[PDB]
Write an enzyme that holds these catalytic residues in place. Structure first.
Site, mmCIF file in Angstrom:
data_model
loop_
_atom_site.group_PDB
_atom_site.id
_atom_site.type_symbol
_atom_site.label_atom_id
_atom_site.label_comp_id
_atom_site.label_asym_id
_atom_site.label_seq_id
_atom_site.Cartn_x
_atom_site.Cartn_y
_atom_site.Cartn_z
ATOM 1 N N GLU A 35 0.822 -1.206 0.000
ATOM 2 C CA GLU A 35 0.000 0.000 0.000
ATOM 3 C C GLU A 35 0.858 1.259 0.000
ATOM 4 O OE1 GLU A 35 -3.201 0.644 -0.235
ATOM 5 O OE2 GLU A 35 -3.992 -1.414 -0.206
ATOM 6 N N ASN A 46 -7.624 9.943 -5.610
ATOM 7 C CA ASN A 46 -8.573 9.073 -6.278
ATOM 8 C C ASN A 46 -9.525 9.895 -7.138
ATOM 9 O OD1 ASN A 46 -8.375 7.416 -3.221
ATOM 10 N ND2 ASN A 46 -7.694 6.472 -5.142
ATOM 11 N N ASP A 48 -12.670 9.973 -7.107
ATOM 12 C CA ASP A 48 -13.833 10.479 -6.390
ATOM 13 C C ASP A 48 -13.520 11.701 -5.536
ATOM 14 O OD1 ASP A 48 -12.390 9.372 -4.283
ATOM 15 O OD2 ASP A 48 -13.893 7.873 -3.754
ATOM 16 N N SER A 50 -11.363 11.786 -3.145
ATOM 17 C CA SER A 50 -10.775 11.382 -1.882
ATOM 18 C C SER A 50 -9.263 11.215 -2.025
ATOM 19 C CB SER A 50 -11.395 10.075 -1.383
ATOM 20 O OG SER A 50 -10.901 8.967 -2.118
ATOM 21 N N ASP A 52 -5.897 8.865 -0.097
ATOM 22 C CA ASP A 52 -5.441 7.804 0.798
ATOM 23 C C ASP A 52 -4.181 8.271 1.518
ATOM 24 O OD1 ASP A 52 -7.507 6.221 -0.279
ATOM 25 O OD2 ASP A 52 -6.185 5.437 -1.835
ATOM 26 N N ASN A 59 -8.423 6.027 3.678
ATOM 27 C CA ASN A 59 -9.112 6.820 2.671
ATOM 28 C C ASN A 59 -9.945 7.924 3.310
ATOM 29 O OD1 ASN A 59 -11.852 6.946 0.730
ATOM 30 N ND2 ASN A 59 -9.900 6.914 -0.384
ATOM 31 N N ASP A 101 -15.366 -3.153 10.355
ATOM 32 C CA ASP A 101 -16.529 -2.550 9.710
ATOM 33 C C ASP A 101 -17.402 -3.583 9.011
ATOM 34 O OD1 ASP A 101 -15.723 -2.458 6.562
ATOM 35 O OD2 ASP A 101 -17.600 -1.355 6.879
#
Length: 129
Positions: A35, A46, A48, A50, A52, A59, A101
């Site tokens: 990562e 990203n 969208d 967002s 990271d 994120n 989650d």
């Protein structure tokens, strides 16, 4: 900061990641490698809007607040700049929420693409534990 492999394994074990929610320590080390290449300052943008953040690439749409991400939920209740720290505590604490989650470590694309289904224990091999 850029961690060494065993240095990070020791640090993640101290923070209770080993076998957390059913995921042995090698999983978390292998996810951090692919990562962020063990770098606490890695960031990635990203489509969208967002971003990271940090060693585990948390994120900004769901978990941390960076003040520039539309639809932010901030489920970890943390500003994203705290995840760029050399100290991984805030990244680890957020990671524990993420894995609890619902879909475990599948939140980490690099983990499920290049870590899952391999022998991840090899990622802690040779490390003082």
């Amino acid at each position: 900061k850029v961690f060494g492999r065993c240095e990070l394994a020791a640090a993640m074990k101290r923070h209770g990641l080993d076998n957390y929610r059913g995921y042995s320590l090698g999983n978390w080390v292998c996810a951090a490698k692919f990562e962020s290449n063990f770098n606490t300052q890695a960031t990635n943008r990203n489509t969208d809007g967002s971003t990271d953040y940090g060693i585990l690439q948390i994120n900004s749409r769901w978990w941390c607040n960076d003040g520039r991400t539309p639809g932010s939920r901030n489920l970890c209740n943390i500003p994203c700049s705290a995840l760029l720290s050399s100290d991984i505590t805030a990244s680890v604490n957020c990671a524990k929420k993420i894995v609890s989650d619902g879909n475990g470590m599948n939140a980490w694309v690099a983990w499920r693409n290049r870590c899952k289904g391999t022998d991840v224990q090899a990622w802690i091999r040779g490390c003082r534990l």
